[PDB]
Every structure is written in C-alpha cells, then in structure tokens.
Amino acid sequence: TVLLEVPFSARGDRIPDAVAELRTREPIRKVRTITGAEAWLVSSYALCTQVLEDRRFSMKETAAAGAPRLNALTVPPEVVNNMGNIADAGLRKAVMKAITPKAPGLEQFLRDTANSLLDNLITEGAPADLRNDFADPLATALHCKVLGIPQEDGPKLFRSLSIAFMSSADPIPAAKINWDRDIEYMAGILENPNITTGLMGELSRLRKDPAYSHVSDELFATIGVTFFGAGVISTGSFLTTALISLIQRPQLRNLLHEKPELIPAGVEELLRINLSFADGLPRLATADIQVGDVLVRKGELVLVLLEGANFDPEHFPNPGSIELDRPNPTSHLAFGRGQHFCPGSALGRRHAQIGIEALLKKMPGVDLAVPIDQLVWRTRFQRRIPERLPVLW
Ligand code: HEM
Ligand SMILES: O=C1N[C@@H](Cc2ccc(O)c(Br)c2)C(=O)N[C@H]1Cc1ccc(O)cc1
C-alpha cells in the first residue's frame, strides 16, 4: 500500500470516519499531498493548537523555493506573507478598522441585500440555488461595500475565484492572467477620485499621506485583491455549507426561526462543525520541534486539520451535535489561531448571522429540493462547496 493521501474527501456534508480513527491512534501522522510531497497531518485539538501558536511553524516559509508543498502557489510568493507586509507598512490597524461589521449602515445594507436576493428567488419560483443566487452574491455585495468599490464590479472580480482558490498540484496559467488583471483593477481604483469610502477609500488616502510615501503601490493594490478574494470565498463557502447543516437539522432550523436571538450561538456552532476548508492549514517548520510523539524536523511541512480539532471529543463533547449552550463556544479553530488568526472574523460572523436570519424569515420551510447525495462537491479546491444548492420552500 502507498502512503495515506490527503485530502480524504471533498464532501462538506459529512466528516469521514478516518478522521476520528487518526485522531485517536495517530494524531500526528505522515501523509502525501497532491504534489507528491510528504507532510505531517495534525488532527487533535491539543496538537493543532500547539502548531498554530508556535511561530516557528511558519506560514511565510511555505512559499520558499524547494519546500515540500501542499499545493502550487496561485499568488506571487511574497503574498503568502500578506499580513506581515501589511504590518511592516504600518497598515494593520487601518485595514482592521475598515473590515469591521460596525460601520454605520453596513448591517442594514446586508439585511436589505439578503432580503432582495430572497425576494427574487421567491418571484422566480422553486427550485432556487442558494449558493449561486444567494450566499455568493451576498458575499460579493458585502465585500464591494466594505471595499468601497462599485457593486457592478463584483461579478467580474468574483469570476476569478473558481481558479484563484484552486488546490492544484501544478501552477495554473489562468491564475496569473486573472491576478494581473485584478491587480490592475485595484490600482485603477486607487487613482479613481470617486472611491472615497471603505477599505479602498482609506488606502487611497493613506497612499497620499507622507507617513506612507514609501509604501509600494503594489502592496496597496494587493490588499484590495486579497481581502476581496479571501473574504468572498470564505464567507460565501461558509454560509453555503452552514445552510446545508441547518436544512439537515429541522429542529434547529425551527428553534432559530422561533428564537432569532439564538442565531449568534447557532452560527458559532455552525462555524465549529464547518468543513469549508478543504485542506489542513500549511506551515513549514523552521526548527526541530516535538509535536506529540513525532520530532518534526526543520524544513518539513505540517498540515493543521481544522475539523480534526473542531470534532475532537476531548475538547467538544458530543462533537457532531450542535449544542447552543457549550461552555467553550468560541474556542473552535474555524478562524485559525495565533499569529494568523482571521482578521475578518467579525465580518464573517455577521454575514452568516444576517444571511440566516433573513432566510428563515422569508423561507421558513426551506428544504433541499434534491437528495443530499446529489450535491456535486467541487474538487481540487481550497474550499469544500456544492456547485449548486437547490432548495424549495
Ligand atoms: C466565515 C468566514 C471566514 C472563515 C471561516 C475564515 C477562515 C480563516 C482561517 C482559518 C484563516 C487562517 C489561515 C491560516 O492560518 O493559515 C483565515 C485567515 C485570513 N482570512 Fe479569513 N475567514 C473568513 C472570513 C474572512 C473575511 C471576511 C476576510 C476579509 C474580509 C478574511 C480574510 C482573511 C485573511 C486576509 C487571512 C490571512 C490572515 C493572515 O495571513 O494572517 N477572512 N481565515
Ligand atoms: O492574505 C493572504 N494570506 C495568505 C494565507 C492564506 C492562504 C489561503 C487562504 O484561504 C487564506 Br484565508 C489565507 C496567502 O497566501 N494569500 C492571501 C489570501 C489569498 C487571497 C486571494 C487569492 O487569490 C489567494 C489567496
């Protein structure tokens, strides 16, 4: 037999039994990735947290030439260090402030957009596709608003994402074509006097402030492309797979419909059980480090399996059940942990909370319109998502 291959399954509606078996028997284990490289797969909560909290397991160094790779880069190697570059430029605080869900009227815009999308699906009649005609457009509209760019430019930027977030064994020619085009777009945005709000409006002002005169135009444009792409793919894919988990739990769907004040706690549990990340989070050891029973050596690749941690019964008893009264509800790893913890975590929560609130009000009887096994799971991608999510109500 050949060495165990990752990823185990592209399905986002069920966790393979192999995960709990590995976690119990071999919570750090050698595997082979799609590139042919070997890596250490970490699958318990305790070891996942250890890796993510030790900066000697480096994100930036995953991009080094000659390193064992989870997958091929779809961005320039410097962009793997995006958050470090933002910090070095003195821009971290300003970026964080621009992506909070607390801007005036942002939540009202999200509710208005979600309700408009749902009204259009109702008018058209069932079946409706909740990914392509709800979750993704809501994510795209949110990110255009947060960035300050025209809503009408969302669709073209969005069309780059089915390639940009591929998890490929080899470089992707289309990823470069789309990247260069999207960078050119954001560079034009920085020069566009109509763009005065949101993240791009703020970056456009900082760009002309003397305290930032030597920050490169490349970085300013890159911030726009990366925050659009990462935010849209992550929120769209999370909401889509959360809606599946909700539809498959009619008792919970009815509880949240009747008591919407529980939606935040329900979204936190949906984050915990979410299988949206298709691969473990990659890190390269910069030193020899003991992790459980394995001495990881300098230069080796480690993969932090989020669902390994989030379904670990030693941390979350009865892990496959959504329970709204856990004592450790936000201690999941859905947004990562440590140096690279997701900077858009609050916006991602609010996107999902508002999307679910609106859906349950407009379509309280929402149900799958096809048997669940008929969903088509995207392969070789950095997220797990169904190509279409057909529902009736
Ligand atoms: C539910 C939605 C979201 C989920 C589940 C999610 C998940 C994650 C995870 C797990 C990481 C850690 C990656 C790693 O450590 O290797 C991360 C990082 C990141 N996320 Fe999110 N995310 C979401 C929403 C967003 C949003 C809305 C934005 C921006 C608008 C965003 C931007 C980023 C960026 C830029 C990073 C990289 C941070 C860094 O390298 O230090 N995410 N996200
Ligand atoms: O900001 C970043 N940090 C790192 C780490 C990272 C990688 C994949 C993700 O899913 C997440 Br989330 C984080 C990076 O390599 N790239 C960007 C995200 C990004 C944006 C647009 C793209 O086309 C491709 C990647």
UniProtKB/Swiss-Prot annotation:
Entry's EC annotation: 1.14.19.70
Residue positions annotated to bind substrate are 74, 82-83, 234, 298, 382
Q: Which GO terms describe its molecular function?
A: heme binding; iron ion binding; monooxygenase activity; oxidoreductase activity, acting on paired donors, with incorporation or reduction of molecular oxygen
Gene3D superfamilies referenced in this protein's UniProt entry, alphabetically: Cytochrome P450 (1.10.630.10)
> What are the entry keywords?
Cytoplasm, Heme, Iron, Metal-binding, Monooxygenase, Oxidoreductase
Where found? Answer: Cytoplasm
Q: Which Pfam families would you find in this protein's record?
A: p450
Q: Name one GO cellular component term.
A: cytoplasm
Q: What class of enzyme is it?
A: oxidoreductase
| Domain of life per record | Bacteria
Where is the site labelled Important for the position of heme?
Answer: 343
SUPFAM superfamilies documented for this protein: Cytochrome P450
* Cofactor(s) this protein cannot do without: heme
- Binding residues annotated for heme, in chain numbering: 283, 340, 342
Q: Which reaction does it catalyse?
A: cyclo(L-tyrosyl-L-tyrosyl) + 2 reduced [2Fe-2S]-[ferredoxin] + O2 + 2 H(+) = mycoclysin + 2 oxidized [2Fe-2S]-[ferredoxin] + 2 H2O
The record ties this protein, via InterPro entries, to:
Cyt_P450, Cyt_P450_B, Cyt_P450_CS, Cyt_P450_sf
Q: Site annotation (Participates in a stacking interactions with the tyrosyl of cYY): which residues? A: 165, 179
Q: Which family does it belong to?
A: Belongs to the cytochrome P450 family.
What the protein does comes down to: Catalyzes C-C bond formation between the carbons ortho to the phenolic hydroxyl of cyclo(L-tyr-L-tyr) (cYY) producing mycocyclosin. Can also use cyclo(L-Tyr-L-Phe) (cYF), cyclo(L-Tyr-L-Trp) (cYW) and cyclo(L-Tyr-L-3,4-dihydroxyphenylalanine) (cY-DOPA) as substrate.
Q: What is this protein called?
A: Mycocyclosin synthase
Name its species.
Answer: Mycobacterium tuberculosis (strain CDC 1551 / Oshkosh)
